[PDB]
Design a protein around this ligand. Structure first.
Ligand code: HEM
Length: 153
């Protein structure tokens, strides 16, 4: 469970993300694909992208990052009461895209990295710990929904 204080630190930094959702999404995906290249293989629509500049130039990748961060933001704003928002995500990611929890760990790492790179003054140790707890909760809850669907990833 996160404390109310922890949720407020999470949402405080999230408001900074919301000032440029597209750019944050791009940096997060680029970091993810650079640090863990195997994850790019999951995206039939993006795996053709060969360089960082191609990734930045891709309107479809930029659009996708807004979709991803919009879904995550909607989840975070529920402060743990996110069943209705999380279930459809679990359904598609377990049954269609087949994304193991370890890949969700990888993108969580990319999120923390990008938020610190862009907002160090609003993302110190305590805020990072809070965001880490929020993403840990997201991953734990999605893993339970995965199992309900029969996926052990
Ligand atoms: C913060 C965690 C993530 C969130 C919030 C998120 C959210 C979303 C959303 C909202 C969609 C569109 C609707 C849907 O199909 O469910 C989507 C699609 C997709 N996701 Fe994720 N995602 C996350 C992590 C990942 C990761 C790490 C991967 C791969 C390693 C992945 C793979 C995919 C793929 C392949 C699609 C279909 C893209 C397309 O061709 O249109 N997701 N995701």
């Amino acid at each position: 469970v996160l404390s109310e204080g922890e949720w407020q630190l999470v949402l405080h930094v999230w408001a900074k993300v919301e000032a440029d959702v597209a750019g944050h999404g791009q940096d997060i995906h680029i970091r993810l694909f650079k640090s863990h290249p195997e994850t790019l293989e999951k995206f039939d629509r993006f795996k053709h992208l060969k360089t960082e500049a191609e990734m930045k130039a891709s309107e479809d990748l930029k659009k996708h990052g807004v979709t991803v961060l919009t879904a995550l933001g909607a989840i975070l704003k529920k402060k743990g009461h996110h069943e209705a928002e999380l279930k459809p995500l679990a359904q598609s990611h377990a049954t269609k895209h087949k994304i193991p929890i370890k890949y969700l760990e990888f993108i969580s790492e990319a999120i923390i990295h990008v938020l610190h790179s862009r907002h160090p003054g609003d993302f110190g140790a305590d805020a990072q710990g809070a965001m880490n707890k929020a993403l840990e909760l997201f991953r734990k809850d999605i893993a339970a929904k995965y199992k309900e669907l029969g996926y052990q990833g």
